[PDB]
Structure formats: structure tokens, C-alpha cells
Design a protein around this ligand. Structure first.
Ligand SMILES: *[C@@H]1O[C@H](CO)[C@@H](O[C@@H]2O[C@H](CO)[C@@H](O)[C@H](O)[C@H]2NC(C)=O)[C@H](O)[C@H]1NC(C)=O
Ligand SMILES: *[C@@H]1O[C@H](CO)[C@@H](O)[C@H](O)[C@H]1NC(C)=O
Lengths: 438, 104, 49
């Protein structure tokens, strides 16, 4: 037997699936979603980290001159100075008063802790969804991990389950994101090779162990002060620390739909959106034949109390006449109210009690016990507590039944007005007829 | 290595009609943030230093607020309002207006 | 109400009865240590002061 259904993607919401085939007793199905994970496929662009400025000792030549050649080093800057007179702790350094020369250079290289502290720039693509779903029917109660792609097929008690695909293709990650430690940011970044000093991306590297580096930090040297041996330099501070100071608000405290965001790997968990179609193929050994199933006749329903709250605020009692004891599957054929128990025990006494939850002022639904079917309708009162720490356990519906009190008032007023208008139309028609016949 | 932090005091919760007013009693500068779990959330975060009181809306979809170093706490609001849903016509009018004003 | 004025009330200075509502909650001790942990809303009298 093959069946198809749709279920809501909300964590913790119980779902009852009803399956009926000729020649077999109805069976009920319990499927609950425990945890959902949404992972996007990422490709790295570049990484960034703080730096150090390697400045070596100056070269001082007494009575001579020097020239320096360019080097293939990140942001190398050399400059040769004329007319200098060093001093040291003992005395002068060279005889020549004005025939001297000092050679200065400096460059920038990534810090020694770049491998432990760095920020990565990624690009988000189409994202996949995986979930952990539990299945309950009969005497089997198992939890399985499933890919929600329309391709995965799991087996539970000799039954094939095929999930997905998700109805809504919505992802909370933008096209370009930045990941640091355990936070993600929807922030665009400058392209590789075009960084700007003082901000994010002044240093870029294709990977953590890459031997090539691109640095643009605006290093400039300066002429040494008279009678001193030093190499001065003015440079814009590191952009990584600046980004670390006013990066902004992390997406961990901005994601809609209550999506918890983790890293390693980058994923968003417990997102509430869309519906998951379910396709299945049951075996014939999971049902029960009619001959050995109980028969329920003359079943009528009533409701004792009702209060539309987030819990199961409502009880209803079923009266019936049977032939033998047994266990029956019970389900609500509507959406306004959701039951709690999936199976019930029937006895010769002729009374069973059920719990249910709703959100409408006056619900109406059809409750089925085994092969029997009966209708229920009731009036519910609002609750008093304002705020509760658990999510709602009812599908959100508010419209009352056609036979509810307010709709009854509307119906009776409209009926009176319509009858009055119909009478007026009839009197106009009869007057027109008698006038025309003359 | 693994190093140690203190957990901030739990705050005082006062209920209301789709609203929560919190009392904060910090001993240090702590970070207080909240968000709503709807389509378009209303995020907020700040560095509390002294004793203040804040009011956070709690729509039917839900709220989550992160105080200090504790785990975040979520709250939801029930469908509560005034009037009687089975009385004279003005009573049900008042009830449904209290639930959803503009549509009624 | 805790944390505000009048969280600890006594009918007079020498009275033997007391009304205190300060939200005193205990906590489980950390493993391998002897101590009593507790979280308590600060005094409302200082807050009022
Ligand atoms: C020793 O000191 C003399 C200076 O007293 C140096 O002679 C200078 O040499 C440079 C280039 O060789 C000339 O431009 C200067 O005009 C010279 N000065 C004088 C006063 O002759 C000499 O080079 C030094 N030698 C060493 C080995 O340091
Ligand atoms: C299903 O198994 C889980 C794991 O032991 C258990 O917590 C749960 O109560 C079981 N449910 C039923 C209906 O037996």
C-alpha cells in the first residue's frame, strides 16, 4: 500500500496521519520532528588576520654611499638617506661629518598566531536540509536521520519512507558572509587584491598556509632625527582589530524564524518554515482485518469542558455499543482541533474519554473511533494566564463554525432581511403583472 | 585552556497583555539582547551597567531574550482578551475586537 | 515585591515576625567542591536609597 501526506515543519508538533484501505481496520500514524539542520555549500575566497612589521637594523656606511634594489616582498619600502652623523654610547660612529649614509627598509608579514586567530570570507550557495524524525505506530518506536531532498529512503519496520522536498526555498544567509570563531555575519567584503588600508581586508591570503600574501597598509619611512640611530615609520593600524571592535550585530541575534546559528560546519538549526511532503509504502502485516477488529455502532459525542489554550484544554466523552473488547485507532478528521492520544481502549461498558486542544471560539469536527464516525461541536471560553513558556500545540485557526453563536446571529438577521426583501420583490412583481394585464 | 566566568542573576518577570517588563539587577556590565521569532524580527542589544527596567513585546509567534551568561529563555503569548464570546452581540464584538481590532 | 521598596517588612522595630520575599533559589554544587550556591535579588532598600 502506498500513501502520501504533508506535515508541518515545526519542532515538537505532534502529527497524526490517517490511513484507511478497504478490508482493513484504520491505522493511525505518529510522526514528530526532533531537530532540523540547514547547511549551505561554501567556497572560500580569502582569510585575514593581524600582522607584524619586520624592520631590520639600519645599515650605516662611513664615508660612502649605498643604493638598494627592489624586492618581491609584501609592501617593501626602502629609502636611502644622505648626510647623517650617528651617535652611540661611546662616541661618534664615523669620521666623515657629512659623507655618511643610512639605509632603511621594512615590510609586513602575517602574524605568528594567524593560524589560531583568523576571519574567513565565504560565498553562500544553494543550501541543503537534513533532519531527525521519529516514527510511532503499533509496537515500533524509532528515530531516524533523513536527508530532506526527495532522494533519501529509510526503512522502519519493513516500511519505506521518502521525505521532502521542502516547499519553501528560503535561506537566512546572504550571498557573501564572514565567519569568526562562532559567529556569522551578512557583510560584504572587498575583492581579493583590492583591499584598502585601515578596514577589513588590508591583508588577504588564498588559504591559511599559502606562501603568497597581499598587503596594503600605507607604510612610509621618515628621516632619522639628528644624532640618533633609529628607523622611524608611520603606518595605519591593523584593520582586523578595527573590524573586531565595531563589526556590528552578529546574525546569531538577528536570524528570523528563531533559527539558532552554529559553526563548524556553518549551519542553521530549528528553522520553522514550510511543509515536508511524506511518501510511504506500508506492508500488509501492519494492519488488522475487519473480522478480528471490533465493530462500533450507535456512537454519539459530547464535550464536557473546553478552554482554548496552548495546552490540551478540553475533554470529550464518547458513548457506543460494541461486541468485544479491543483497541481502536482514534483520529480527528478536521484541522481546527488536534487530539492527544492516537489509540484508545474500548470496553463493553461503553464510554471512553479523550483530550484535545483548539484555538477557536466554537469548534466542530468529526471524530472517528475505528470504523465508526460521529460529529462533535462545543463552545469554549478564553483563558486567564497571559504568557506561557511553551509553544502552542494547536494548528492556528480562529474562524468559528457555521452554527456558532455569532454566526447564528448573523444568519438569523440576514435571513430576516432576505425574507423581507423577497416579500417586497414579490409585491412589486404582482403589482406589475396586474398593471400590465389591463 | 578552559577558564571561568560567573552567571548573572536571573531577572524579575512581570506579565502583561502581550508584553513583559523586566527588572535588571547587574553586578557587572552585562549584555542584554532579545529578538522575536516572526517573519521580520525586532532585534536589540545593549550594555547594561546599572539597575534598569525594560519592556519587551511578546507576539503570538514568540520571544527570546539573552541575559548575561545564562542560556536564552523563550516565551509565548496566549489568545487572551476581554469580553464574553457567548453573550449579547456587543459582547462577542468586544471579544473579537480585543483579539484582532482592525479586522473586526 | 522583590528588588523594590518593602521587600522585607516588620510591623515594628522589636516585632518577632517578618515578611521577606527575595526570590532565594539554590543551585547544585559544582563537582569536586564543598560550597552552597544561591542566587538572590539584591536588597530593595538600597535600590530605593
Ligand atoms: C679613514 O678616515 C679618512 C678620513 O680622515 C677617510 O678618508 C676619506 O675617504 C673618503 C672616501 O674614501 C673621501 O671621500 C674623503 O675625502 C676622505 N677624507 C680625508 C680627510 O681624506 C678614510 O676613508 C678612512 N679609512 C677607513 C678604512 O675608514
Ligand atoms: C519512544 O522511545 C523514546 C526513547 O526511549 C521514549 O522516550 C518515548 O517515551 C517512547 N515513546 C513511546 C510512545 O513509547
Amino acid at each position: 500500500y502506498e500513501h502520501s501526506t504533508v506535515m508541518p515543519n515545526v519542532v515538537g508538533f505532534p502529527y497524526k496521519a490517517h490511513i484507511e484501505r478497504p478490508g482493513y481496520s484504520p491505522l493511525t500514524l505518529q510522526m514528530q520532528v526532533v531537530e532540523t539542520s540547514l547547511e549551505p555549500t561554501l567556497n572560500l575566497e580569502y582569510i585575514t588576520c593581524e600582522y607584524k612589521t619586520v624592520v631590520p637594523s639600519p645599515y650605516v656606511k662611513c664615508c660612502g654611499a649605498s643604493e638598494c634594489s627592489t624586492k618581491e616582498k609584501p609592501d617593501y619600502q626602502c629609502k636611502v638617506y644622505t648626510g647623517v652623523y650617528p651617535f652611540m654610547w661611546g662616541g661618534a660612529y664615523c669620521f666623515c661629518d657629512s659623507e655618511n649614509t643610512q639605509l632603511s627598509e621594512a615590510y609586513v608579514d602575517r602574524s605568528d598566531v594567524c593560524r589560531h586567530d583568523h576571519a574567513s570570507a565565504y560565498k553562500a550557495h544553494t543550501a541543503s536540509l537534513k533532519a531527525k524524525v521519529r516514527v510511532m505506530y503499533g509496537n515500533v518506536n524509532q528515530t531516524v536521520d533523513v536527508y530532506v531532498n526527495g532522494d533519501h529512503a529509510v526503512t522502519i519496520g519493513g516500511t519505506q519512507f521518502i521525505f521532502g522536498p521542502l516547499s519553501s526555498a528560503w535561506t537566512p544567509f546572504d550571498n557573501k558572509i564572514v565567519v569568526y570563531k562562532d559567529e556569522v555575519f551578512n557583510q560584504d567584503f572587498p575583492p581579493y587584491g583590492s583591499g584598502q588600508p585601515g578596514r577589513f581586508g588590508d591583508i588577504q591570503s588564498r588559504t591559511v598556509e599559502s606562501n603568497d600574501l597581499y598587503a596594503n597598509t600605507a607604510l612610509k619611512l621618515a628621516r632619522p632625527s639628528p644624532g640618533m640611530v633609529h628607523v622611524p615609520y608611520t603606518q595605519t593600524p591593523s584593520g582586523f582589530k578595527y573590524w573586531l571592535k565595531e563589526k556590528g550585530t552578529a546574525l546569531n541575534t538577528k536570524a528570523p524564524f528563531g533559527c539558532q546559528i552554529k559553526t563548524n560546519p556553518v549551519r542553521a538549526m530549528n528553522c520553522a518554515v514550510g511543509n515536508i511532503p511524506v511518501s510511504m509504502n506500508l506492508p500488509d502485516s501492519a494492519f488488522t482485518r475487519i473480522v478480528e477488529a471490533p465493530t462500533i455502532i450507535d456512537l454519539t459525542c459530547t464535550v464536557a469542558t473546553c478552554t482554548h489554550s496552548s495546552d490540551f484544554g478540553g475533554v470529550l466523552t464518547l458513548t457506543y455499543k460494541t461486541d468485544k473488547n479491543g483497541d481502536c485507532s482514534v483520529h480527528s478528521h478536521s484541522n481546527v482541533a488536534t487530539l492527544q492520544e492516537a489509540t484508545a481502549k474500548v470496553k463493553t461498558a461503553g464510554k471512553v474519554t479523550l483530550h484535545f486542544s483548539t484555538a477557536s471560539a466554537s469548534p466542530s469536527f468529526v471524530v472517528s473511533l475505528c470504523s465508526a464516525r460521529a460529529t462533535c461541536s462545543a463552545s469554549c471560553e478564553p483563558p486567564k494566564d497571559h504568557i506561557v513558556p511553551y509553544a502552542a500545540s494547536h494548528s492556528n485557526v480562529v474562524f468559528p463554525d457555521m452554527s456558532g453563536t455569532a454566526l447564528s446571529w448573523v444568519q438569523k438577521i440576514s435571513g430576516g432581511l432576505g425574507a423581507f426583501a423577497i416579500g417586497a420583490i414579490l409585491v412589486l412583481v404582482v403589482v406589475t403583472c396586474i398593471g400590465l394585464r389591463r | 585552556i578552559t577558564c571561568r566566568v560567573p552567571m548573572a542573576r536571573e531577572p524579575t518577570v512581570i506579565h502583561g497583555k502581550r508584553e513583559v517588563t523586566l527588572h535588571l539587577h547587574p553586578d557587572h556590565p552585562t549584555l542584554f539582547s532579545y529578538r522575536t521569532l516572526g517573519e521580520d524580527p525586532q532585534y536589540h542589544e545593549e550594555w547594561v551597567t546599572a539597575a534598569v527596567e525594560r519592556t519587551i513585546p511578546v507576539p503570538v509567534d514568540g520571544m527570546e531574550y539573552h541575559w548575561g551568561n545564562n542560556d536564552p529563555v523563550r516565551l509565548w503569548s496566549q489568545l487572551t482578551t476581554e469580553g464574553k464570546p457567548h453573550g449579547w452581540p456587543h459582547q462577542i464584538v468586544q471579544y473579537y475586537y480585543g483579539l484582532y481590532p482592525a479586522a473586526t
